[PDB]
Every structure is written in C-alpha cells, then in structure tokens.
C-alpha cells in the first residue's frame, strides 16, 4: 500500500506495537476521539440574500454593455402596465392602486 517493509521492519517490534495499542486505548478512554434550527434558518436566509445579490449583479452586467454605449433615457422610454404590476407585486404592492393611469 505504498509503504516500505524495509522501512517499517524493526527487531523487538512487539513492545512498540503493544505500546501503540495501549496508547490508543488511553486515547479513547480520555476522549481524544469523542465526537461532539435557528442557525440553519439564518444560514438559509443568508444564502438566499447571496443568491439575490448574484441575480442583481447578473442583471446589472447584462444591461451594462462593454464600452460606453449611449443609451435611451428612462424618461424617454415607456414601460408596460404588465411589467409595472409584476414588479410591484413582487415587492408586495396592492394593485388596485394602479389601473386607470395610462
């Protein structure tokens, strides 16, 4: 198993072995090897926050473009009621407020 019998051969090796198992028994007796909800949910919340950060970074880099392209201003472009209502109720906005508008 990748080990040299020549390196590990030693006369009077029974004493060394017996010392080794005696030391092990001491170690388990002592506790050298004794293995010992809110945290899970807070970690889950943090992971969701990180996912949202990645998503918003992806949207930003998606809209960014590479080298200084002149873009149409928001006040010039027009946006649909479906998109506005969707975004608002994703943030949690009651939608009977909008509807007449334009």
């Amino acid at each position: 198993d990748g080990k040299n019998v020549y390196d590990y051969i030693d006369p009077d090796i029974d004493a060394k072995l017996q010392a080794l198992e005696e030391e092990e028994e001491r170690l388990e007796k002592e506790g050298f090897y004794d293995e010992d909800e809110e945290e899970e949910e807070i970690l889950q919340k943090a992971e969701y926050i990180r996912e949202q950060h990645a998503l918003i970074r992806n949207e930003a880099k998606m809209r960014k473009s590479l080298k200084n392209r002149a873009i149409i201003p928001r006040k010039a472009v027009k946006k649909p009621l479906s998109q506005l209502e969707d975004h608002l109720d994703q943030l949690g906005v009651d939608t009977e407020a909008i509807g007449l508008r334009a």
Binding site: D1, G2, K3, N4, V5, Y6, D7, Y8, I9, D10, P11, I13, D14, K16, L17, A19, L20, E21, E23, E24, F32, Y33, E39, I42, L43, K45, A46, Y48, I49, R50, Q52, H53, L55, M62, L88, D89, Q90, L91, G92, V93, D94, T95
Partner: protein, 179 residues
C-alpha cells in the same frame, strides 16, 4: 526497489517515474515529475511554494510529532530474514496505517474546529444589513389568502405556511416579440 520521496514536493517517486539530477558536490536530487524539475531549475523554494509537503509541515498543515510517525524510518543496520518477523511487520503496517488515518482525521478536525461560529456570525451580519432582500410573499398571494382564510375561518398560520411552501418550491431574460 524502494518508493522514493520527491526532493521538491514529497509525493512518492516510483521507479521509471521522473528524473534525478547529480550535483558536483556528490549527492543526488530525485524529482518525481517535470513540474518539480523545472521549479528547482528555476530555483524556486519548496519551503515557500504552497503545494509542497515542506510548506504543509512548515505552516503546520500536517502532523509532525506522533509515534505513528516515528515508526517510519530509513534503516541503516540491516537485519536477518525471519518469516514471522516479516509477517508481523505486515500486520503492524496495516495497524499503523489505519491508526495514522484516524489520527489524521482528528488533526484535521482539531485544526478546522471553528467554522460554524464564523459562518453564523457572517450570516447574522448579512441578514441584519440586508433585511429587505429576504423572502417576501406577493400581493395577490396575501390578498388571496385573506379570502381563503375568511372561508376557512387562520390568516397568520396560512401565511407562514405558504411562505414555507414557496420557499421549498428562476427568471428568464426577455420574451417573444409578437409577429
């Protein structure tokens, strides 16, 4: 035949595997591969490069003091062949190997003891200063619930029930333009 150890990195230098270099001082440099050979020829320091056993034992990433580690040694005064001695040596090899593995597991865990504390503290900070990005409900949902909770006689539990259901259960880019 002997399983040599690479001078630069320490992985087993098996026969027919690698190149050895002979300095004029009179002692030989055995390398296990071309990576190690080229690194030594460029005179980089194995004690400094972080993929070497030298770095692991200098930064304390591997145990250096253990009776399991003093069983291993090159032997300079040879012994006579003895069948029972060799067989008991084989069995001792097995026992020492499993003991070393299990103590190595303990060493790794004792080193990487504190992980949950730091991760959970980072989670508290992330939640505390990113309160607004936490899983929200949805207007139509909240509204709908109110009607169904009115039907079933409960609003609060119905909320934190579906808040879970939806959390247990991605956005595309753009959409079809009508032709």
């Amino acid at each position: 035949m002997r399983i040599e150890n690479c001078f630069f990195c320490g992985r087993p230098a098996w026969p027919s595997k690698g190149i050895t270099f002979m300095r004029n001082d009179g002692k030989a440099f055995r390398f296990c591969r071309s990576k190690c050979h080229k690194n030594f020829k460029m005179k980089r320091n194995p004690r400094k490069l972080k993929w070497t056993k030298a770095y692991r034992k200098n930064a304390g990433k591997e145990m250096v003091v253990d009776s399991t580690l003093q069983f291993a040694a090159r032997r300079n005064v040879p012994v006579r062949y003895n069948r029972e001695l060799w067989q008991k040596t084989l069995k001792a090899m097995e026992r020492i190997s499993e003991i070393r593995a299990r103590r190595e597991r303990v060493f790794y865990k004792k080193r990487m003891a504190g992980k949950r504390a730091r991760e959970v503290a980072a989670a508290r900070k992330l939640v505390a200063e990113n309160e607004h990005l936490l899983p929200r409900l949805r207007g139509s949902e909240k509204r709908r619930l109110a009607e169904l909770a009115a039907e079933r006689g409960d609003v609060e539990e119905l909320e934190r029930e579906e808040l879970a259901k939806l959390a247990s259960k991605s956005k595309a880019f753009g959409g079809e333009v009508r032709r």
